[PDB]
From Swiss-Prot, chain A:
Belongs to the universal ribosomal protein uL22 family. One of its GO terms (biological process) is cytoplasmic translation. Keywords: Ribonucleoprotein, Ribosomal protein, RNA-binding, rRNA-binding. PANTHER family: 60S RIBOSOMAL PROTEIN L17 (PTHR11593:SF10). InterPro entries: Ribosomal_uL22, Ribosomal_uL22_CS, Ribosomal_uL22_euk/arc, Ribosomal_uL22_sf. This is Large ribosomal subunit protein uL22. This protein binds specifically to 23S rRNA. It makes multiple contacts with different domains of the 23S rRNA in the assembled 50S subunit and ribosome. Contacts all 6 domains of the 23S rRNA, helping stabilize their relative orientation. An extended beta-hairpin in the C-terminus forms part of the polypeptide exit tunnel, in which it helps forms a bend with protein L4, while most of the rest of the protein is located at the polypeptide exit tunnel on the outside of the subunit. One of its GO terms (cellular component) is cytosolic large ribosomal subunit. It comes from Haloarcula marismortui (strain ATCC 43049 / DSM 3752 / JCM 8966 / VKM B-1809) (Halobacterium marismortui). SUPFAM superfamilies: Ribosomal protein L22. It comes from the Archaea. GO terms for molecular function: rRNA binding; structural constituent of ribosome.
From Swiss-Prot, chain B:
GO terms for biological process: DNA repair; translation. It comes from Haloarcula marismortui (strain ATCC 43049 / DSM 3752 / JCM 8966 / VKM B-1809). Part of the 50S ribosomal subunit. Interacts weakly with protein L15. Residues 8-21 have a biased composition (Basic and acidic residues). This is Large ribosomal subunit protein eL32. Residues 1-87 are annotated as: Disordered. Residues 38-64 have a biased composition (Basic residues). One of its GO terms (molecular function) is nucleotide binding. GO terms for cellular component: cytosolic large ribosomal subunit. Keywords: Ribonucleoprotein, Ribosomal protein, RNA-binding, rRNA-binding. Belongs to the eukaryotic ribosomal protein eL32 family.
Swiss-Prot record, chain C:
One of its GO terms (molecular function) is rRNA binding. InterPro entries: Ribosomal_uL13, Ribosomal_uL13_bac-type, Ribosomal_uL13_CS, Ribosomal_uL13_euk/arc, Ribosomal_uL13_sf. Signal peptide: none annotated. It comes from Haloarcula marismortui (strain ATCC 43049 / DSM 3752 / JCM 8966 / VKM B-1809). One of its GO terms (cellular component) is cytosolic large ribosomal subunit. Part of the 50S ribosomal subunit. Interacts weakly with proteins L3 and L6. Belongs to the universal ribosomal protein uL13 family. This protein is one of the early assembly proteins of the 50S ribosomal subunit. Binds to 23S rRNA. The keyword rRNA-binding applies. Keywords: Ribonucleoprotein, Ribosomal protein, RNA-binding, rRNA-binding. It holds the Pfam family Ribosomal_L13. The gene is rpl13. This is Large ribosomal subunit protein uL13.
From Swiss-Prot, chain D:
The gene is rpl4. The chain holds residues 51 to 99 of 246 of the full protein. Belongs to the universal ribosomal protein uL4 family. Residues 42-49 have a biased composition (Basic and acidic residues). Part of the 50S ribosomal subunit. Interacts weakly with proteins L18e, L24 and L37e. Has been cross-linked to L18e. One of the primary rRNA binding proteins, this protein initially binds near the 5'-end of the 23S rRNA. It is important during the early stages of 50S assembly. This is Large ribosomal subunit protein uL4. Residues 1-49 are annotated as: Disordered.
Length: 150, 142, 142, 49
RNA sequence: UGUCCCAACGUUGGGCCCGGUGAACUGUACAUUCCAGUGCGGAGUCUGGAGACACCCAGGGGGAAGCGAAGACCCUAUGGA
RNA sequence: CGCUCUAAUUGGAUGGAAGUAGGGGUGAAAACUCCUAUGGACCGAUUAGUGACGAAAAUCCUGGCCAUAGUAGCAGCGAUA
RNA sequence: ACCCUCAGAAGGGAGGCGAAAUAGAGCAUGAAAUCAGUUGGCGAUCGAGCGACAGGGCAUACAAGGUCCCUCGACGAAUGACCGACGCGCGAGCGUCCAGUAAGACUCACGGGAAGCCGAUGUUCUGUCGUACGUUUUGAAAAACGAGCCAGGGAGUGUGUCU
């Protein structure tokens, strides 16, 4: 798995990670990209709206065939990745909790750094026509999050 | 409180007029990179030189713009070939005994990278006392 | 609107190509040029064949397109563009520092370039850009 | 016999594959094949005196 | 008698948008092209021009002498059956 | 010029070897060498030998990996639940 | 180990051991292809063998390179004048003299200047040249054949005889 790729001052910082999550790595890059710079609390509200379907996540890189969304500003394609979003909510719940156990005001902290990394694939095989089988795998994702005092 | 290199770091060699002229020429003229053809088009093809052999190779045929082909005509002046840019002739050194016979006016010494700090210290102090410059000196805080 | 032209050229009764060739040369030298009275510029030859050529250019085209100007305005400017490497940075810079005008929006009267004037008293086979545009279907806005 | 203990055969043309002896869909025997024979190996018969 | 004149409207499953799952084919490189020319005589890439702000969605498949298969035709081999 | 191991002669290394990454110098070049970080135990030079000794290619072999793509399929069957 | 978190013997946070956890369990080292984030350069008006050689922008901790810029002056190969004087030509222009002079690449010396400053490196812009590589072929950029990319593997060897 990963290690934190950015330095973090322990006195004004809180950390968290997800390990080998079986979820879309592409949905993860998009989500991380969108919530960085946000407040922990803002991020939580944002992802809940995504899960609810009232807020789209801009898909700027993995957008082939993706329909346009009116709420996406400065871009067109977007979706509502609920699974990856739920995993991020778990990530934030942890971070904010770690933050609190350290004396900070979790929710109010800024997401200084957030990033997903594909750590592997749970390999699978799908039988096909003509007596042949082909790959049918699941991405495994690690993700780091660093909260920092305003 | 600051880093200082050991030895005669500033020392320069004394060269005949003709040698300094040829050293200056080499530095002015230079040479082409002489990297293998198309090394930049394929990652699996490294920079290390290989004679282009293709019957149709544009470089092998000498087409302008496809890079120079290695030839003896590109050789550096005999009198200066191999000299450190400073004009000194290098002498690879592994220990204190290697310093024996070395002309500090004409040669500078390069301590092999494998030599440890304990032996480098001895080599560096006696080289300086022999008037020999050490191209790769230790930097101590003084 | 407002064009700090370092040179204001009068095309009235002048050979379009000979003017264009000079305006090109000058714009590539850094000069900002304005061609005045384009509609009154002229080209030698048999009106019938001349017009056929320009008419052919209008009809040429396809989805990719071949936008050929009909007004004496653009005809002249396109003529100049053909004497400039308009796709290179330098070429486009020069071309963009040249503007052609119908009539004269300036106070000063432009100058007449050497060897570009046509003597109407010793020439009968020639045509006016304005006439060409009228034949092409342009809207005589002059 | 290192590398030769196999009945691997080449399929020949037809499947967009190089003509290399294969067995159980795995290449074998030929020198460019992993697990294949050594083309010109050291030999006992050589007079080293 | 919708085979046709000559096509229309409708029904169900898709298609389209959303959650989840999640391959393959294919890939020398570069690549926004078009008209002509040239070239081993069938060029996105050479030459001259023309056109060309970037990204994305849906479509029917004009081109990549598209992908798929070391041509079955034909000849050649001091080949095979 | 470079690679393996042998021999003689002779050196380096826990005061940090090999390897790797980035960087400096030399050689027309094969390639040599130094610095910094990583690494944490081995490594050379000269001479005479040795050879399962040098790859961009073989629809080459094996493994890994990107685009393809969040795309095709997860509808079609007289059993539509 | 303990504590916080969690649906939780998961995972995460904090913490503990050890020279080292970036030695934490398929765990020595940890290349390339390649992915995430991020830095430098370019960037939504513009053209494609991706470069070589020249030359500019912008970027750069140290180390292992230390040079480079401008005045002037010295030297100065080939080449080599303007102006002016005189003489020709219808004319463009030429001849003689000034003069093989002034000039003239490199190199050096005095004085002055630079430390992102010179080299070098990354990227980008401009100029010149440029339709991969290997093979087949009289002729390959080829609408002839091969390869998605990278790493590792992958082809004159032995005995006998003869020369
Ligand atoms: Cl993925
Ligand atoms: Cl030589
Ligand atoms: Cl058109
Ligand atoms: Cl141009
Ligand atoms: Cl006339
Ligand atoms: Cl010189
Ligand atoms: Cl041979
Ligand atoms: Mg779609
Ligand atoms: Mg079956
Ligand atoms: Mg390369
Ligand atoms: Mg084997
Ligand atoms: Mg073109
Ligand atoms: Mg065939
Ligand atoms: Mg037959
Ligand atoms: Mg037969
Ligand atoms: Mg010896
Ligand atoms: Mg080859
Ligand atoms: Mg493979
Ligand atoms: Mg598709
Ligand atoms: Mg029913
Ligand atoms: Mg390890
Ligand atoms: Mg032929
Ligand atoms: Mg290899
Ligand atoms: Na995209
Ligand atoms: Na939008
Ligand atoms: Na919007
Ligand atoms: Na004319
Ligand atoms: Na037209
Ligand atoms: Na066997
Ligand atoms: Na033997
Ligand atoms: Na019907
Ligand atoms: Na098509
Ligand atoms: Na293949
Ligand atoms: Na540069
Ligand atoms: Na061939
Ligand atoms: Na070729
Ligand atoms: Na062709
Ligand atoms: Na593939
Ligand atoms: Na071999």
């Amino acid at each position: 798995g990963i290690s934190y790729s950015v330095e973090a001052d322990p006195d004004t910082t809180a950390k968290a990670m997800l390990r080998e999550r079986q979820m879309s790595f592409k949905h993860s890059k998009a989500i991380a990209r969108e919530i960085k710079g946000k407040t922990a609390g803002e991020a939580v509200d944002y992802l809940e709206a995504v899960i609810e379907g009232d807020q789209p996540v801009p898909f700027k890189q993995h957008n082939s065939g993706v329909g346009h969304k009116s709420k996406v500003d400065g871009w067109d394609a977007g979706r509502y990745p609920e699974k990856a979003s739920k995993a991020f909510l778990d990530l934030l719940e942890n971070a904010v909790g770690n933050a609190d156990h350290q004396g900070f005001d979790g929710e109010a902290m800024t997401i200084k750094h957030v990033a997903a990394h594909k750590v592997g694939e749970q390999q699978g095989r799908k039988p096909r026509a003509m007596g042949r089988a082909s790959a049918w795998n699941s991405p495994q994702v690690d993700v780091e999050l660093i909260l920092e005092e305003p | 409180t600051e880093l200082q290199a050991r030895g005669l770091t500033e020392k320069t060699p004394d060269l005949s007029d003709e040698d300094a002229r040829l050293l200056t020429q080499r530095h002015r003229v230079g040479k082409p990179q002489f990297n293998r053809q198309d090394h930049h088009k394929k990652k699996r093809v490294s920079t290390s030189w290989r004679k282009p052999r293709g019957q149709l190779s544009k470089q092998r045929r000498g087409i302008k713009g496809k890079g120079d082909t290695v030839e003896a005509g590109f050789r550096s002046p005999t009198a200066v070939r191999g000299k450190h840019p400073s004009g000194f002739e290098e002498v690879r050194v592994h220990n204190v005994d290697d310093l024996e016979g070395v002309d500090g006016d004409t040669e500078a010494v390069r301590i092999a990278s494998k030599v440890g700090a304990r032996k480098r210290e001895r080599i560096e102090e006696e080289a300086e006392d022999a008037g020999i410059r050490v191209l790769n000196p230790t930097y101590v805080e003084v | 609107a407002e064009f700090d032209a370092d040179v204001i050229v009068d095309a009235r009764d002048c050979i379009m190509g000979r003017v264009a060739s000079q305006v090109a040369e000058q714009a590539l030298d850094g000069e900002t040029v304005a061609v005045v009275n384009a509609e009154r510029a002229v080209i030698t030859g048999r009106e019938e064949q001349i017009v056929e050529k320009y008419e052919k250019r209008v009809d040429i085209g396809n989805d990719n397109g071949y936008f050929y100007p009909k007004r004496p305005d653009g005809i002249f400017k396109r003529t100049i563009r053909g004497m400039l490497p308009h796709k290179k940075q330098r070429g486009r810079e020069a071309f963009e520092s040249v503007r052609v005008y119908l009539g004269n929006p300036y106070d000063e009267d432009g100058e007449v370039l050497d060897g570009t004037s046509l003597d109407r008293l010793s020439n009968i086979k020639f045509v006016t850009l304005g006439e060409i545009s009228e034949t092409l279907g342009a809207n005589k806005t002059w | 016999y290192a590398g030769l203990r196999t009945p691997a055969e080449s399929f020949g043309s037809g499947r967009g594959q190089a003509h290399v002896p294969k067995l159980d869909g795995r290449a074998r025997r030929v020198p460019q094949a992993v697990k294949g024979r050594s083309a010109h190996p050291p030999k006992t018969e050589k007079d080293r005196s």
